[PDB]
């Protein structure tokens, strides 16, 4: 039936959770080109601001429908609608900090609706995250592979620090399409290039966030 | 004294495991200083659970720990302010749990508020296939770091085939008392034994625990401790 | 200066994996600036291997990486001093590898000395049951830390049933060149593709690799 | 006999940690059934160590463990065949150790052969800066898996600033006895306490350990 993902679509996000005991909430509105793999989002901290932790760790928590797929690789996420999908992720930082995320992605007309829950634990008191000594993400590469009827992903991310060092993390994600399994055109092993740029940061409250993404094979 | 010989438990828990939302409510009682407690947990939403309940049991109570050898009770002494804690539990087969908990004191009742998110539990693993049979007793190591109490522990989940499914826990305990008033313990161990006494209708569970905070006693050292 | 368009490889490796001792010797060649190489490996002791050879392949060569976009070659520029590296590889099923490697240059030959210890590979896992079918291409992130070059990567071992067995690699690369003379690169990626050309009688293997150092393109 | 009340220890250890080659030899004695032992360790090569000796300490003895509660001693009952074990130790700051060990019996002497590879210890971390002050006592969990004995433990390294540096150990113990003659124990705990009694000139170390195998008491 009708194709539900358009050249131009918008984003509505609500995210709440707890990082090292600190409760917070934020809302996001954005837009992008799903098939060109580009998107931009404006995030407003609505509760718990100003954040006592670096916003940068929220960034990869704030969008798998906006990925350009090349080489005929099936789009597990775009093809999931109208049902949509959820995903679960644990991100383990090398200094002990850890993030676990549950996300819900649904489609409402021209708007992707994102619902995000986040719990963070054991971020070191004098680490770059809790001290806010971070300076954005390096581009990262995710490996995507099928397992037991759903799509799994793992990636390494490198958080830039204001002392010059990188703070790395390991991500494990399971993506769950709500589509009938037999109706799933599951992709094969492939890569996902993600580049996140925080265009603006204001008053520890307002953040403009840009991402370009591509699903591809090696070279 | 704010903590007495016999006290009661009121718990609310909400979370999502591998995409499945659930809520549960607990009521129980125990002897804080004898390090024993029992709680009745009802799954109020998302029941019957599509996963093994056993992984919720250690999410469902640090005030009921018997402290020996003069080890300060970071949890009992935190009141009336109380405390929070945060924890990530990594299972050897890829599954993971992250928990936030709030512990406060209302008269004779300890109030527990728990939020849980679980990810990447293997579809055919013991947890999602409900092939578990309770926990082995666990030893947590407790040590101070940056003004608060940290804890790490290995947990061994018994499987129905006779095997064990192990996991690694990292927890930060955060007392709400002013740092000036905190009486921080030194490095020590926490023995925890969990027993699920009842399961009824995949919706009602009875859970008992005993716990002791101690130093290493089996292999002694020339200067304490 | 010391690295030319065509060079050879002489490798010696010994180690123990899940209690099984082994030794092997390798001889190969490649084009350092085109980022390609091939090598013939013979299990000289402990053969036939009771484990999948596939896990040894990423242990058997950083001088054969094509560097684009002006990225300084930490490994090629390390000579004549050369370099060492240390790596731990953790498999998702509990198996783990730790490797020490020594790389030196004698005339036209790169000299590789490799030590490996493997622990806790599951008895019925793909590695010990030899149910593996080579590696997916992998991406390593390279970044400077405390005067030397660090590397992390995820690797995915293909299994005969179709599934993947993933692992996490953490590596520190140590140039023997004086710190003041080291031309440290910035954060970048490393694409590695490993193909096992031949695998005979659990003792004789041919191994090909193409590698590229690049930014996010 | 084969394990008597008073036996001796002969150890040889070799390895590399962050690229630094080292060798050390050990001589000691203890009471296997009282779970106590002492040992003198000499750094024979690579001295003085550029890293803290403390991380070598738990690499340097499963025979000297007092078994209470009727726990079968997997290690004592492994002789004359003896046993090996394999271990990976992951520190919270990125450093890692992987060890292969061989334990055999020669008359009144336990013979230990140890291979160690260490990777990615932070340049300014406690280990490489030698800011450690001995180990806290540890608890290992022991459980059977696929015909052999597995172990996991948390170890906490005391640091000079008061903090602790924790690590996670995964070990597989492999008895050389025939599977059919193996008396495998059930899930139990292992209490280990290590004390370094002397440590002259970064080349000589005296090391004491008491150990007990038990249930939860
Ligand atoms: Cl920030
Ligand atoms: Cl159940
Ligand atoms: Cl093979």
């Amino acid at each position: 039936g009708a194709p539900l993902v358009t050249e131009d679509m918008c984003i509505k996000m609500t995210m709440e959770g707890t990082i090292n005991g600190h409760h917070f909430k934020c809302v996001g509105e954005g837009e992008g080109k799903p098939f060109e793999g580009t998107q931009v989002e404006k995030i407003r901290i609505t509760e718990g601001g100003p954040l006592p932790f670096a916003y940068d760790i929220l960034a990869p928590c704030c969008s798998k429908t906006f990925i350009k797929h090349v080489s005929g690789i099936p789009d597990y996420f775009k093809e999931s609608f109208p049902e949509g999908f959820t995903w679960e992720r644990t991100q383990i930082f090398e200094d002990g900090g850890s993030l676990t995320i549950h996300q819900d992605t649904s489609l409402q007309g021209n708007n992707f609706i994102f619902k995000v829950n986040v719990i963070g634990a054991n971020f070191p008191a004098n680490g770059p995250v809790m001290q806010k000594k971070t300076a954005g993400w390096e581009p990262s590469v995710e490996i995507l592979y099928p397992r037991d009827g759903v799509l799994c992903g793992q990636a390494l991310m490198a958080l830039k620090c204001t002392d010059g060092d990188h703070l790395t993390s390991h991500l494990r994600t399971t993506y769950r399409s709500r589509k009938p399994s037999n109706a799933v055109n599951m992709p094969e092993f492939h890569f996902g290039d993600h580049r996140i740029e925080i265009l603006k940061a204001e008053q520890g409250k307002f953040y403009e966030q840009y991402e370009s993404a591509v699903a591809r094979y090696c070279e």
Side-chain angles (χ1 to χ4, degrees), chain A:
Chain A
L4 304 147
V5 183
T6 321
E7 177 187 12
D8 293 280
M9 307 203 75
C10 302
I11 302 165
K12 291 218 246 140
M13 182 217 65
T14 62
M15 162 190 298
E16 65 171 313
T18 307
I19 312 290
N20 278 21
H22 307 275
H23 171 84
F24 74 98
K25 195 182 289 184
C26 61
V27 297
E29 59 175 28
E31 70 193 21
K33 309 266 195 181
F35 299 91
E36 296 182 15
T38 54
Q39 64 177 123
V40 59
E41 189 178 346
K42 292 181 180 181
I43 294 93
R44 175 195 187 101
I45 307 303
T46 52
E47 295 180 13
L51 301 175
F53 56 88
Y55 171 79
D56 281 337
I57 68 158
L58 298 187
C61 302
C62 301
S63 175
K64 306 285 290 173
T65 56
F66 293 89
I67 303 174
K68 181 179 66 176
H69 283 63
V70 301
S71 298
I73 304 174
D75 200 321
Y76 187 70
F77 310 100
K78 285 192 185 59
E79 299 175 32
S80 74
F81 295 105
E83 292 85 349
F85 61 93
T86 69
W87 55 267
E88 57 213 53
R89 166 186 303 164
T90 293
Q91 184 169 359
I92 304 296
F93 291 71
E94 58 178 342
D95 62 348
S98 60
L99 278 181
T100 301
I101 302 101
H102 178 264
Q103 201 264 15
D104 190 282
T105 295
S106 62
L107 179 60
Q108 177 190 296
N110 191 242
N111 301 325
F112 290 115
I113 311 294
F114 297 159
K115 182 182 182 64
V116 191
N117 291 113
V118 174
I119 306 178
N122 308 311
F123 286 95
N126 300 121
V129 175
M130 299 306 299
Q131 290 299 322
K132 300 181 181 242
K133 265 57 191 178
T134 69
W137 296 96
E138 297 286 1
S140 55
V141 179
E142 186 183 28
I143 53 174
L144 288 311
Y145 55 94
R147 176 173 293 180
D148 294 322
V150 293
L151 188 62
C152 293
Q154 292 183 236
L156 299 171
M157 294 191 73
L159 182 56
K160 292 195 286 284
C161 299
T162 66
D163 57 19
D165 275 316
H166 288 83
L167 183 60
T168 68
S169 49
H170 180 198
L171 288 71
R172 182 181 284 272
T173 314
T174 301
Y175 303 98
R176 306 184 184 274
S177 177
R178 288 152 164 163
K179 264 245 156 182
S181 73
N182 269 330
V184 166
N185 202 33
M186 187 70 64
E188 293 168 1
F189 188 96
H190 64 278
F191 298 94
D193 283 312
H194 298 91
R195 185 188 294 269
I196 306 169
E197 309 166 37
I198 314 288
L199 302 177
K200 305 259 188 208
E202 274 215 294
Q203 322 198 60
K205 191 187 184 119
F206 303 110
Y207 301 91
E208 193 168 24
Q209 199 176 320
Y210 166 88
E211 164 163 321
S212 54
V214 178
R216 53 158 188 86
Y217 298 121
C218 177
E219 59 186 37

